[PDB]
Amino acid sequence: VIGIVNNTVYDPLQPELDS
Amino acid sequence: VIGIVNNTVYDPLQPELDS
Amino acid sequence: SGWTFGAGAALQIPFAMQMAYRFNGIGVTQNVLYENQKLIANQFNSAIG
Ligand SMILES: *[C@@H]1O[C@H](CO)[C@@H](O[C@@H]2O[C@H](CO)[C@@H](O)[C@H](O)[C@H]2NC(C)=O)[C@H](O)[C@H]1NC(C)=O
Ligand SMILES: *[C@@H]1O[C@H](CO)[C@@H](O[C@@H]2O[C@H](CO)[C@@H](O)[C@H](O)[C@H]2NC(C)=O)[C@H](O)[C@H]1NC(C)=O
Ligand SMILES: *[C@@H]1O[C@H](CO)[C@@H](O[C@@H]2O[C@H](CO)[C@@H](O)[C@H](O)[C@H]2NC(C)=O)[C@H](O)[C@H]1NC(C)=O
Ligand SMILES: *[C@@H]1O[C@H](CO)[C@@H](O[C@@H]2O[C@H](CO)[C@@H](O)[C@H](O)[C@H]2NC(C)=O)[C@H](O)[C@H]1NC(C)=O
Ligand SMILES: *[C@@H]1O[C@H](CO)[C@@H](O[C@@H]2O[C@H](CO)[C@@H](O)[C@H](O)[C@H]2NC(C)=O)[C@H](O)[C@H]1NC(C)=O
C-alpha cells in the first residue's frame, strides 16, 4: 500500500480475556 | 439446506481465550 | 450465469446460489431461501403455470 501509516490498532478482547 | 457440506469453521477466540 | 454475462464473460453459478444472491439484493438473508427452497420453487412454478 502506498500511503500506509504506522499506528496502533486497539483490541477490545485482549484486556478482557486477561481478566 | 440442500447442498450443505461438512467442514470446520475456525474460531479466532478459542485459542486466545485459553491463553 | 446470473447477471455476470451482462458485465463480462459468463461465469456459471448454481441457480439456487444465484437466487440467494438475489434474495440478498432485496434485504432478505440467504438462509431464508435455502430453508424455503422447495416452497419457493413451487411458488415460482405455479406462478409460471
Ligand atoms: C504526497 O506528495 C508530496 C509532494 O507534493 C510528498 O511530499 C514529499 O515526500 C518526499 C518523500 O516521500 C520528499 O522527498 C519530498 O521532499 C516531499 N515534498 C515536500 C515538499 O513535502 C508526500 O510524501 C506524498 N505523500 C503521499 C501520501 O503520497
Ligand atoms: C513503521 O515502523 C516500521 C518498524 O516497525 C518501520 O520499518 C523500519 O524503517 C526504519 C526506517 O526506514 C528502519 O530503520 C527499520 O529498520 C525498519 N524496521 C522494520 C522492522 O521494518 C517503518 O519505516 C515505519 N513506517 C512509517 C511510515 O513510519
Ligand atoms: C447435483 O446433481 C448431480 C447429478 O448430476 C448429483 O450427483 C448424483 O448424486 C447422487 C447421490 O444421491 C448419486 O446417486 C448419483 O449417481 C450422482 N450422479 C452422478 C452421475 O454423479 C449431485 O449430488 C447433485 N448435487 C447437488 C449439490 O445437488
Ligand atoms: C456430516 O457429518 C455428520 C456427522 O456429524 C453425518 O451424519 C451422519 O451420517 C452418516 C451417514 O449418513 C451416519 O452413519 C451417521 O450416523 C450420521 N451422524 C449424525 C450425527 O448425524 C452427515 O451425513 C455428514 N454429511 C456429509 C455431507 O458428509
Ligand atoms: C407461507 O405461505 C405459503 C403460501 O404459498 C404456504 O404454502 C402453502 O401451505 C399450505 C398449508 O401447508 C398448503 O396447503 C399450500 O399448498 C402451500 N402452498 C404452496 C405453493 O406450497 C406456507 O406453508 C406458509 N408458511 C408459513 C411459514 O406459514
Contacts of residue C40, Cβ cutoff 8 Å, sequence gap at least 6: C19, C33
Return d(Cα A2, Cα A17) in angstroms, integer. Answer: 35
- The technique by which this structure was obtained is cryo-EM
Residue where the block lists cell 434485504: C27
Q: How would DSSP label each residue in A1-19? A: -TT--------SHHHHHH-
Query: Which chain B residues are within 8 Å of A13, Cβ to Cβ?
Result: 13, 16-17
Return d(Cα C10, Cα C8) in angstroms, integer. Answer: 6
Under 8 Å between Cβ of C30 and C23: yes
Return d(Cα C12, Cα C18) in angstroms, integer. Answer: 10
Shortest-distance ligand to the CA of residue B6: 4
Find the Cα–Cα–Cα–Cα dihedral C29, C32, C38, C43, rounded to 10°: -80
Under 8 Å between Cβ of B17 and A15: no
Return d(Cα C10, Cα C16) in angstroms, integer. Answer: 17
Phi, psi of B3 (to 5 degrees): 110, 0
